[PDB]
A paper describes a structure:
We prepared crystals of Ntaya and Zika virus MTases and soaked them overnight with 10 mM AT-9010. The structures were determined by molecular replacement, and the electron density for both expected ligands, AT-9010 and SAH, was clearly visible. The AT-9010 molecule was in both cases located in the GTP binding site, as expected. In fact, in the case of the Zika virus MTase, we did not observe any density corresponding to the γ-phosphate of AT-9010, and we therefore did not model it. In the Ntaya virus MTase, the amino group of the guanine ring forms hydrogen bonds with the main chains of Leu16 and Leu19, while in the Zika virus MTase, there is an additional interaction with the main chain of residue Asn17. The 3´-hydroxyl group of the modified ribose ring interacts with main chains of Ser151 and Pro152 and the side chain of Lys13 in the Ntaya virus MTase. However, Lys13 adopts a slightly different conformation in the Zika virus MTase, positioning its amino group 4.5 Å away from the 3´-hydroxyl group of the sugar, thereby not allowing the formation of a hydrogen bond. In addition, the Zika virus MTase has a serine residue at position 152, which does not form a hydrogen bond with the sugar ring, whereas the Pro152 in the Ntaya virus protein does. The α-phosphate in the structure of the Zika virus MTase forms a hydrogen bond with residues Lys28 and Ser227, while, in the case of the Ntaya virus MTase, there is arginine residue at position 28, which does not interact with the phosphate group.
Author numbering: 12 to 270
Amino acid sequence: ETLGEKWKARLNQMSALEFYSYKKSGITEVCREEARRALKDGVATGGHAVSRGSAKIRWLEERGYLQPYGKVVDLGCGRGGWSYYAATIRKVQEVRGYTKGGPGHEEPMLVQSYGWNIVRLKSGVDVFHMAAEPCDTLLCDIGESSSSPEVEETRTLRVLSMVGDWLEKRPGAFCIKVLCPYTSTMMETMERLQRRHGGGLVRVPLCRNSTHEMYWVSGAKSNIIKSVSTTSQLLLGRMDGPRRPVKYEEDVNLGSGTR
Ligand SMILES: Nc1ncnc2c1ncn2[C@@H]1O[C@H](CSCC[C@H](N)C(=O)O)[C@@H](O)[C@H]1O
Ligand SMILES: [Mg+2]
């Protein structure tokens, strides 16, 4: 039994009050109250991010874990937070977004932050059925939390199998969400993937404590077992400590205008 699997077992045993207290304890979060009201009014020129994903992907890029450029493919774009942030980067030529958009899923949102005119967001697209294309930056944020590790592991592996066909085209940069990296099989799978495509797993502090999600980014180089184990220790430690306040930060503002 791994530490992450122990974390998942402990998480499922929490009561509602225990879980919600632990979910945001000590995590970093961007303030989106201003963004929510502006978006609901239909404001598209205020620079607001359509979701908290823009801050997530910026945290990785600002620290040099990937440098988006060329043609960017955003698989599972949802509202489009990754695509809108990717559209503001120097060497990005265009951003192609795809998302399933089902009953519980998200539909693309149309805003006019900087570089909006080089973005195409398409809804109703299941990426498991579309053919892999060559690209320069491969983005994927797919994987849905579940109570059982078996479902999370299965969902993660299906994503990685689909992503492997895109990575065979060898994009220069990638950022792939790994919902469940904490099983021995998943650690083994990532090791083979890292040997073949490089990169490494990174834990973003904006992530909630209720998910073990890590991001496979081309710029990272750390060991996979150490990366997952260190993250599992952090999540386990926050369980047995008193509730720590949320570290709030200003949300990302992406400006306005065409490129
Ligand atoms: N098979 C699939 N094909 C395409 N999109 C999928 C998918 N399974 C899940 N998704 C979508 O992937 C999205 C992951 S949420 C990520 C949102 C985005 N990173 C942002 O910054 O806003 C969800 O909205 C979900 O609808
Ligand atoms: Mg979750």
